Chains A and B, each alone.
Chain A
Amino acid sequence: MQYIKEYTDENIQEGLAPKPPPPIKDSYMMFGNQFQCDDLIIRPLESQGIERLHPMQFDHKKELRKLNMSILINFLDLLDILIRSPGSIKREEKLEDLKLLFVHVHHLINEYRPHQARETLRVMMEVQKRQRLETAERFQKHLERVIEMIQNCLASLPDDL
């Protein structure tokens, strides 16, 4: 670990001689060890690296139920491999196969994660709005009570006079 010493040497000065902040980077950086280039998609697609089993119909809940049932049936077929021919080539495919299935079951529900994120903003806004109105109504009731309180005390005072 080290401390940037050249810029801290730069900072000890007066007048306008100190330095300005650096401009914003809109391209590849190298923070840490990863790159973290900007304009990235939050969910990088499945077509970048692995196969894709599902079409663009993509109605998430049906395909998640399909992938659940496919995981269970491929486990049963792996049991059929272990019963019939353990020395087959297919088990290596099978021990790859359900792996791909498991990847997709994660990769679909990660696609619920931006949506969940957006949706929590929505309900926060609704709760925010409601709380504002509640305080408004609360305060107005207090205001009314204070007014009538003042009124009845004023209603008391000529009765003393």
Chain B
Amino acid sequence: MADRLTQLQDAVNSLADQFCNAIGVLQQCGPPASFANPTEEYAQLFAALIARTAKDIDVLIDSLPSEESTAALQAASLYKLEEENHEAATCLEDVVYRGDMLLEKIQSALADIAQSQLKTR
């Protein structure tokens, strides 16, 4: 979850829910007639909410990606990234190898110093 796409899905469903809620409120409750003010306030609030939801859906649509970046542009970039990841792997391996050799040398040197110091006693 937590994507712009799930936000857009929930916004569209909230639009449909505001449609059903707006009709079910503004038909069920009203002042009778003449051949109330709370109902008028309800209508204004519902219209404002529907407009805001529409604007948000439009903004999220603008936000997602274009009809450029077709799937082949993703695939070729993926191929190039696999090659460069191989090269980065071998480079990391080389630096680790040099560090390992240097570490084994200094370790053996320190062991020999300790052996001499214990043998002198």
Contact = CB atoms under 8 A, between A and B. Distances in A.
A109 B5 contact: yes
A135 interface: yes
Contacts, number: 88
Q: Is the interface of B mostly helix, strand, loop or mixed?
A: helix
Contacts of A58: 67
B48 interface: no
A79 B29 CA distance: 16
Contacts of B57: 68
Contact of A118 (B67, B74, B82, B102): B74
Given A61-B67, A118-B74, A129-B85, A136 B12 contact: no
B21 interface: no
B10 to A, nearest CB: 11
B88 interface: yes
Contacts of A102: 12, 16
Contact of B81 (A115, A125, A140): A125
Contacts of B50: 72
Interface residues of B, number: 40
B30 interface: no
A116 B5 contact: yes
Interface stretch (A11-19, A20-28, A142-150): A142-150
Contacts of A109: 5, 8-9, 64
Interface of A: 58-61, 64-65, 68, 71-72, 75, 82, 102, 105-106, 109, 112-116, 118-119, 121-122, 125-126, 128-129, 132-133, 135-136, 139-140, 142-143, 146-147, 150
5 contacts: A61-B62, A61-B64, A72-B50, A112-B65, A115-B74
